[PDB]
Design a binder for this molecule. Structure first.
Ligand code: CYC
Ligand code: CYC
Ligand code: CYC
Ligand code: CYC
Ligand code: CYC
Ligand code: CYC
Ligand code: CYC
Ligand code: CYC
Lengths: 160, 59, 161, 39, 160, 161, 161, 160, 160, 161, 161, 160
């Protein structure tokens, strides 16, 4: 959580939580309801969101799904969709958290090494997350899209 | 008795993501006995010794 | 470390399923508690030094422990005792805001009992002092805040003993 | 029984590095004392 | 500033600003006008607050106020009040900034050394800060008083 | 480091006086510009790799520097060149968020010329590359963000000396 | 330090005796099979990445281990898992070149079981992954060299279990 | 070089090279003529090897030469051939040296960073290196191919 | 072993064995039969060489053999000769291994401290080793003597 | 650092060209002289201590430098004087065997002149001692070996300059 | 660093003869004066804090330097200013006890003026305050001790230079 | 001086000289007269003590004086005597100073290496120092002999 990140900084500083840090925690408390509503919308439209994102990503880079590609074949394409779904669930967790702390520990630490080992293309994965961001903006309110887009954007940058 | 020595070592082996300019070019003060090991260590790293000076008054 | 929200997120990740209604209300409980938590944290920081002083006065001051040969009968020993109590109080205040005992387990209560034993400092004396600090803290923070602070401080005292 | 992400995740710590002169320089100083000596 | 602290952490991590950190800066932008209004009120009532708090501090610590204390005589008391006024101005600057780091640079560094050099009592300085907090609560709104109280609480810890 | 608010605070501290109304107006202008600056910084982070790629290609792709003996003709030198360019972009981006270039000048522009002289890198060629990156960054971010980014990049160009 | 030739020398040193005919014969056997061992070791190093990829595909992937809550569910755990297999292979190939199983016990198997138990790694899953690596390595190295590599791989598995 | 690596160890030790280290130097001296002969063959047929290896790499990984691949178009494909030629010449330099250290210093340090930034697939570049090794095996004697294959394989591992 | 020393360096560098290191191992194995043949010849003639070298060393350093020297009396001289015999066996082991590491582990680690504790003269011990080396070079075949000379020279340097 | 082959490779890399026949001839000269150089270097290693002693006596035998106030007139000063010459001899032997002097210049000569200037030690006196060491080393190793040792010693003299 | 007796010994060592009778007489006179100097030095140590406070009151109190922007007009600046004065006093006390200001010049005055000039602290103003402190300290310590304090203050004047 | 060494420790503590340390310095001030008188007697009898110690050392180590020894020949023996006399003068300087550390800094640091370069035996040098110590004890008063024995013991430790 944002509180968790502030606590880590405070523990390093060896000082009680700063007044401004507590103020941001108060803001997180205020925005808990709005963040939960946005996360509920994403979870509700989960299947359609990542389905459209998968079509967009395969259209953008057809060699991911073509013969000789990493996800060539139905089973591997489904596995690629699962990896995207893992990322989508992490983004929903992060939107609830209000901080990048949830995602960073899951899918943003060593992810490049794991993807290189399996053989999947890191740039194509990043584009898939971008396609998800566009779909989410379509399926969410304007300011809801801004916040959700921010969390999505950190995920995309991590892939880079 | 100590010496003020400034040397710059290129970090060829590790292309460090974290800011390493301060390590790349630095000015430090080492004790006279420490200077032998430190000069040998900087030579082992391959960094060029920009300057050697003596803070102590008497040579 | 962990938070209430972070711990629910961890549990959901273990399950492998997106946010459930049960997840929503557990998180919402943390969201509701946030106001009480932050107000209490400000009070705790403001009266932190006074809290330590009150606790030791109520429990260990003017006793044989303070008198010669009591593990607190030196200027250095007394300062160390106050320091360890402040360490426990600060981590406990952190943990109260966080809502989870992971912070206390990871930092506050790691090897502390064994180190205290080998030194010879009384675990029971520390536990009594911690309970006294809990009473003072509950009074200062308020009734609702005192209940939560009691839970976190209870974890520290129980782990020490 | 599934292990959560906290399965030896948090052992790492914040890294303190020197920089341009500011009040944070004493925070770096505090860190040097805090680690080299066991306060 | 809050931006300065967040950017310092991000620079140490060598990462572009996280989504949550950027949100914190955006919150600062949103509440900047309200923070400035509170600071303007403090500056407007600065003289009256100084007088009232000085009376309360003298009541709390009569020995310092009396001859044979640090504020012995009108001149010594005036110098003490001038130092307290500098503290109050620094508190106003910190409240406007939203981060206590500027106030810490102004007064917290070597505060024990300065008080020892003057010979004056640090606890009495802290009591004066508490009197200022009460006056500020009277002269501020409830939401404003809480934030001002938090900055003043950091000042109290600095006095200790 | 320093920020825009910190710079106003430093001026007020040197004066020894409470903040003036005109100084407060300057702070209010910073608060007004903050929203656009923050969104621009988020955009910069998202497209950072694309910005680096385009700028590098415009600056030195298919050039003598890439060709043997051009000082960027080793794989290590190529990677190091990208690393230095990315560091320049990132530090300047943080300074753009602050609104004050003092942090960038102190953190990145201290001793950089001497280090580059020891390295043998062409500071002028790097400055041309940085200007090209400023053009690309302005294009991606937009006009309002480009103007501030251009000012920060101009400060970087001055530091190239 | 222990190697095959060095261990023969060390035993002779403990006796203090000059080189026996039996010691000469054992050392001669090491000299004789060094050629096949060396060629296979080079092949292993060249195809090291493919081997660990094949091993996780054959044993550790598409199961509950990599599904949620399986100690590989997160990218950090996955990266550590492939790294652990890579270290296992590297020190195993070191030891296979050396010819003596003592080296792996000195480094790879010193406290490894205790560390894995503490962290919660499945000992059995690691053993089966090592066996899967053994099959892949045997395929790439060939039967004559793979049989020699298999003995030292199996020693690593025996240490784990 | 073998002498260079021995010099590094000797520099740390500040001691003369042991009899085994001197034997390593003597072995390099003995095989210097063999290294030069192998380099003569490789340099003489270098251009033909480059063109043949390009055909093999394009067959094995047609995505690189496909539309949307890095080497799409004559100019990009020529750049791919030039990059492969640089790698092959580096391999020749390393073979003459007798150690992979010269090749590692010239390139393959940060090569992942550089090529990934350029946008060409690291696995496809590695496949091209493998094709070059196969062509060299066809065009060279087995004993020379053993050493040349070893240095090639070091390049392949670094690419991985 | 030489291969063992190379493996130690490779493990410290956290890299698989270098192609040059593998070539060193191949050369050592190829020359291993001759190395052990030379070592067996040294072991066969060890006793006679020891007697001749001991006489030469006593001639060069009569004072050590005489009263007032470390080897004063027949018993002290016998202990001196026994230490020399152990060193000779260690030298044979090192020559067989092809690396000085076995000899270094057996002796020359703290050997100066042992000599200082006993009072025996290090320069005289070194001269005795040199006399043994000369006699052994005459005794062995030219190719074997060349390798034996290098190992003995390393021992002489350790003595000095 | 550099070697003969490595220096030829560096020149070829700057050129960008394939291996040249003239470069092959230079490398062949290094290979042809390498065997004799290796044998001579082994001799230098065997008699290194004696060579240092003889040179030290030649330059400083009942010397005014040894006499009080001569800058070598201490137990520490005399030991340091011996140590520097020994280190120079070892590095020079490695450089002579390698056939390239750049490594010796970088490791030893870099900063040595500045340190000697700060200490006030006589560079010319050290150069005379180095010349004596070159003469003694040439005598022990042989005329052909002395030529290579002379080149390394000449580089040392240039470093003294 | 050099004691007074050590300096005489160093001169004799450079001469190569045993210490002269005149040098021995100087050492004996140094011992006789040292007894009184030591007693006064103990007095100086006891009242060191009071001496520092008196000097600060004489110059720094109610001064433009105390006024904002005066280079001592900060909490950090004030702590540093008082600390620098105290450090100068301690080093001067050591120099007075030794009878030689060489140690104080070697460390305390080593580039201190250059560093202060770079900082912008007024060296001459600090020297005037130090002279006032020296006068007060000399009066308290005594005439004979004031003579030693005068030598330390002369070293302080050189540090101002 | 001893006071100088105490001052160095006090500087490291960054505190004024310890009360007991100052008392010890005052005792040294009183002891200076006795040190000077004893040193004057030692200087007066220095030449005679040197001659007697040299004769005793020659008796102890006839082989060193004889051919095949370090002092073989008049020139080598004269250099040996000069080294012994220089050490004796340094011992007198150290005794007069009252600080063993000054003597150790001037000489006997790395003295073993210096003796190794000269070729002389450290034990024989030590025996000569012991003979000088006995002569000095006889020449000096009983109180002076006690201090001289301590300085000689430090020299003996340096010799060993
Ligand atoms: C062996 C070293 C050592 C010391 C010295 C020591 C002192 C010490 N002083 C105490 C109290 C105290 N000390 C003072 C001191 C003073 N009040 C004044 O007005 C004066 C200026 C001053 C003394 C002259 C006071 C007032 C208390 C009681 C505090 C209270 O409970 O209100 C206490 C707490 C009560 C207790 O003993 O339980 C301790 C432990 N403890 C130690 O282990
Ligand atoms: C994981 C966090 C953590 C803990 C828990 C910790 C405890 C800790 N307490 C210690 C000692 C100590 N702790 C106390 C404390 C007490 N005296 C009393 O009368 C009370 C019963 C009690 C607490 C109120 C004392 C007296 C010492 C020994 C001080 C000494 O004599 O040197 C020491 C030994 C080093 C020292 O002297 O400080 C440690 C490491 N250190 C840590 O990093
Ligand atoms: C001496 C060591 C060294 C190397 C190797 C090196 C590589 C290198 N590769 C480049 C580009 C490139 N590299 C490739 C590579 C490939 N595309 C593919 O489809 C294939 C899989 C693959 C080669 C077989 C491509 C397509 C470009 C051009 C990118 C572009 O222009 O958009 C460039 C930039 C353009 C230029 O050369 O000016 C460099 C510098 N630089 C060095 O200093
Ligand atoms: C605070 C941020 C920061 C900067 C700016 C910085 C500069 C910097 N650039 C470096 C290297 C380098 N920088 C270049 C750069 C270039 N070569 C070219 O042809 C281009 C014109 C140009 C890039 C635009 C090269 C080639 C090196 C490697 C030099 C070497 O060691 O061989 C190094 C040496 C250490 C290393 O390898 O990283 C530093 C310290 N360091 C820092 O911490
Ligand atoms: C919490 C962090 C985390 C993630 C995300 C994760 C994903 C993950 N993706 C996998 C496979 C895969 N991932 C891809 C990925 C892609 N192929 C494409 O064409 C696309 C460009 C792209 C995705 C959009 C493919 C093709 C496979 C199957 C590999 C194969 O079997 O051939 C595998 C291995 C097979 C398995 O599931 O056992 C894992 C573990 N694991 C994790 O611990
Ligand atoms: C001020 C401190 C100091 C000392 C002590 C010192 C000693 C010293 N002793 C030397 C030689 C020597 N030292 C000895 C010593 C001995 N041989 C024996 O048989 C005896 C057991 C023993 C004396 C009691 C001999 C024989 C030489 C001459 C060796 C030679 O150079 O051939 C030399 C080399 C010749 C020269 O003076 O240039 C030095 C420098 N140097 C110093 O700076
Ligand atoms: C890479 C190899 C290397 C070199 C070359 C080097 C130089 C070097 N020589 C030094 C000292 C020294 N060098 C000498 C040398 C001499 N005095 C004489 O009278 C002679 C003419 C001459 C020898 C031939 C002396 C006396 C000192 C000590 C200086 C002193 O404190 O008086 C020191 C000071 C630290 C120390 O005590 O070692 C360095 C760093 N350091 C190194 O790591
Ligand atoms: C920007 C940060 C900053 C601060 C705050 C500061 C304070 C400061 N306080 C001072 C003195 C003083 N401070 C006090 C303080 C007090 N006496 C009491 O009885 C009370 C309990 C208390 C305040 C309410 C007194 C009495 C003096 C005068 C000392 C004396 O002459 O006796 C002085 C010296 C006189 C002067 O101003 O020249 C300074 C500089 N300096 C700084 O740079």
């Amino acid at each position: 959580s944002v509180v968790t990140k502030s606590i880590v900084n405070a523990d390093a500083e060896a000082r009680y939580l700063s007044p401004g840090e507590l103020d941001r925690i108060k803001n997180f408390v205020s925005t808990g309801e709005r963040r939960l509503r946005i996360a509920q919308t994403l979870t509700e439209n989960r299947e359609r969101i990542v389905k459209q994102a998968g079509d967009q990503l395969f259209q953008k880079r057809p060699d991911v799904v073509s013969p000789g590609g990493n996800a060539y074949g139905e089973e591997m394409t489904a596995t690629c969709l699962r990896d995207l779904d893992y990322y989508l669930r992490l983004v929903t967790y992060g939107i609830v958290a209000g901080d990048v702390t949830p995602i960073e520990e899951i899918g943003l630490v060593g992810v490049r090494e794991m993807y290189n080992s399996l053989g999947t293309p890191i740039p194509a994965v990043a584009e898939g997350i971008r396609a998800m961001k566009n779909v989410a903006c379509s399926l969410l309110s304007a300011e809801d899209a801004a916040e959700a887009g921010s969390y999505f954007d950190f995920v995309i940058g991590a892939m880079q | 008795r100590m010496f003020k020595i400034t040397a710059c070592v290129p970090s060829q082996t590790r292309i460090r993501t974290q800011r390493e300019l301060q390590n790349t070019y630095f000015t430090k003060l080492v004790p006279y006995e420490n200077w032998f090991r430190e000069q040998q260590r900087i030579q082992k790293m391959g960094g060029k010794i920009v300057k050697v000076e003596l803070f102590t008054g008497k040579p | 470390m962990q938070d209430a929200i972070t711990a629910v997120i961890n549990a959901s990740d273990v399950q492998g399923k997106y946010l459930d209604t049960a997840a929503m209300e557990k998180l919402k409980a943390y969201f509701a508690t946030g106001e009480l938590r932050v107000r209490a944290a400000s009070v705790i920081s403001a009266n932190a030094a006074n809290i330590v002083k009150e606790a030791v006065a109520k429990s260990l001051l003017y006793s044989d422990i303070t008198r010669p040969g009591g593990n607190m009968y030196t200027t250095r020993r007394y300062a160390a005792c106050i320091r360890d109590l402040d360490y426990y109080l600060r981590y406990a205040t952190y943990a109260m805001l966080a809502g989870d005992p992971s912070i206390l387990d990871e930092r506050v209560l790691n090897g502390l009992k064994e180190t205290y034993n080998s030194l010879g400092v009384p675990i029971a004396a520390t536990v009594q002092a911690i309970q006294a600090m809990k009473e003072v803290t509950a009074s200062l923070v308020g009734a609702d805040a005192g209940k939560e602070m009691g839970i976190y401080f209870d974890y520290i005292c129980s782990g020490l003993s | 029984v599934g292990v959560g992400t906290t399965r030896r995740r948090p052992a790492r710590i914040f890294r303190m590095t020197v920089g341009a002169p500011s009040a944070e320089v004493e925070l770096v100083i505090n860190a040097i004392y805090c680690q080299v000596m066991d306060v």
